[PDB]
Amino acid sequence: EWKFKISEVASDLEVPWSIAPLGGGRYLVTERPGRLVLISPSGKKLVASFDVANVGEAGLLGLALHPEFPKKSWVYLYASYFAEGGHIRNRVIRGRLDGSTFKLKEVKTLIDGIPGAYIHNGGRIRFGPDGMLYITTGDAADPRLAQDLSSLAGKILRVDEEGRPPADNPFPNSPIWSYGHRNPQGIDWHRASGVMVATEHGPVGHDEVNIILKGGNYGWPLATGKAGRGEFVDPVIDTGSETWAPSGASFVHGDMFPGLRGWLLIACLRGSMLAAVNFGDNMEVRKISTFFKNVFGRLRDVVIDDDGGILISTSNRDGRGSLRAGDDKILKIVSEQH
Ligand SMILES: OC[C@H]1O[C@H](O[C@H]2O[C@H](CO)[C@@H](O)[C@H](O)[C@H]2O)[C@H](O)[C@@H](O)[C@@H]1O
Ligand SMILES: OC[C@H]1O[C@H](O[C@H]2O[C@H](CO)[C@@H](O)[C@H](O)[C@H]2O)[C@H](O)[C@@H](O)[C@@H]1O
Ligand SMILES: [Ca+2]
C-alpha cells in the first residue's frame, strides 16, 4: 500500500491552472480568471492581473519559469483573449518578475493569434531538457486544423526563450513540433531518458498518453486512440470507452518518494483522480494505478516540489465540479516520515 501524508498548501483559489514551485514553500500559480498569485507560508500575494477571455475553458492557463530563474527573471504565461470580431484566441506572453516586491514588469507578447474557443485551447507550457519552451494548443473546436500545418491549433509548439522557432524545428520557419492533437493539457520529460510525454483529451473516451517525437502526427481527427496505421503515431495509453479527462502530468523525481521514481503522475478532471503510470525500459507501460477517486473532486495540475513532494491543484470551481469547503486548493503529498 502507498503510504503518505497530505496537507493543504493553499485554498480558495479560483481554478488554479498551473503551479510553478519556487523553492522553500513559495509557489507561483495562475488562476484561470486572470491572476498570477504568489503563495508563501506567510500567505497569498497578487503578482499580476490580466484581462483574459474568461469564458468556458478559456482564460489564464499555462505558466513556466525560465530555466535560469531567478537569475533570468522571465516568467511565461499562456492566456486567452478576445480578438477582432469577438473571437477567442490564445497568446503566449512574457514578463520580468521583480525579485523584491514581487511584481511583473515589461510584459510582451511572444506568440499571437493561436485559434481558440469555449473549448479546446490547450494551454500547458513548459521548458524541456533542451532549454526550449513547449506549448500545447487544442483544435479550437475545429478538428481539421489539427492536421493543417499552416495552423497553430491542435499542435505542440517549440520555441526559444524569445518565441522564435529554432533552425532545427521540423517544419520551415514554423513553431510546430508535433501535430494531430485534439486538446493536449499535459507535457513532461522523463528525467533519465529525456523522452517527452503528453496527455490529451479524446472525444468523450479515448483519452491519451503519447510519446512525443519531433514532427510526429498524432492522428486527430483522422484517427483516435490506437489506430494501428503507418501514417499516425499511436498513443501508449488509450482509455477506450472510459473518460479520465487528463490535464497536467509530471514524472516523479527527487528524495520524497524513491519508489515512485520515473512514474508519470497525471491529474484528471472529470476522472477526479490521480493516475500513475509506470514505464519500463524502452518506455513500455508496466502498470497503471489510480488514486483519490472522487475524494477531492476535479484535479488539474501535478508538479514535483523542490523536496520531491507531489503538488496537485483542484478544479471544482471551473463550472463543471461540486465544491468542497475552501476549494480550490493546492495539495502537497509527502512521505509518512515527514
Ligand atoms: O469546409 C469544407 C472544406 O473543408 C476542407 O477544406 C478546409 O480545410 C483545409 C484546412 O485543413 C483548408 O486547406 C481549406 O482551405 C479549408 O477550406 C476540405 O478539404 C474542402 O474540400 C472542403 O470544401
Ligand atoms: O504498423 C502500425 C504502426 O505504424 C507506426 O509504427 C511503426 O513505425 C515506426 C517507425 O516508422 C516504429 O517506431 C514503430 O515501432 C513501428 O511500430 C506508427 O507509429 C504506429 O502508431 C502504428 O500503430
Ligand atoms: Ca491520437
Short description:
With 338 residues, this protein is an all-beta fold. Helices cover 0% and strands 43% of the residues.
Description:
The structure is a monomer. The chain is mainly beta and 338 residues long. It has a single domain (1-338), classed as Neuraminidase (6 Propeller), CATH 2.120.10.30. It is built from no helices and 24 strands. The strands form six sheets. Strands 1-24-23-22 form a four-stranded antiparallel sheet, with no helix packed on it. A four-stranded antiparallel sheet has the order 2-3-4-5, with no helix packed on it. A hairpin with an 8-residue loop joins strand 6 and strand 7. The protein is globular. The two termini are 17 Å apart.
N-C termini distance: 17 Å
The string of secondary-structure elements, in order, is EEEEEEEEEEEEEEEEEEEEEEEE
Number of DSSP E strands: 24
The unique ligands bound to this protein are: a molecule of 2 linked components (GLC-GLC), calcium ion
Note the main sheet: 4 strands, antiparallel
The value of Rg in angstroms is 18 Å
Shape: globular
Total number of distinct structural domains? 1
Strand order, biggest sheet? 1-24-23-22
The CATH topology assignment is Neuraminidase
Keywords: Calcium, Metal-binding
Binding site for pyrroloquinoline quinone: 182-183, 185, 201, 270, 298, 300, 320
InterPro entries: 6-blade_b-propeller_TolB-like, Glc/Sorbosone_DH, Quinoprot_gluc/sorb_DH_b-prop
Domain Glucose/Sorbosone dehydrogenase: 13-320
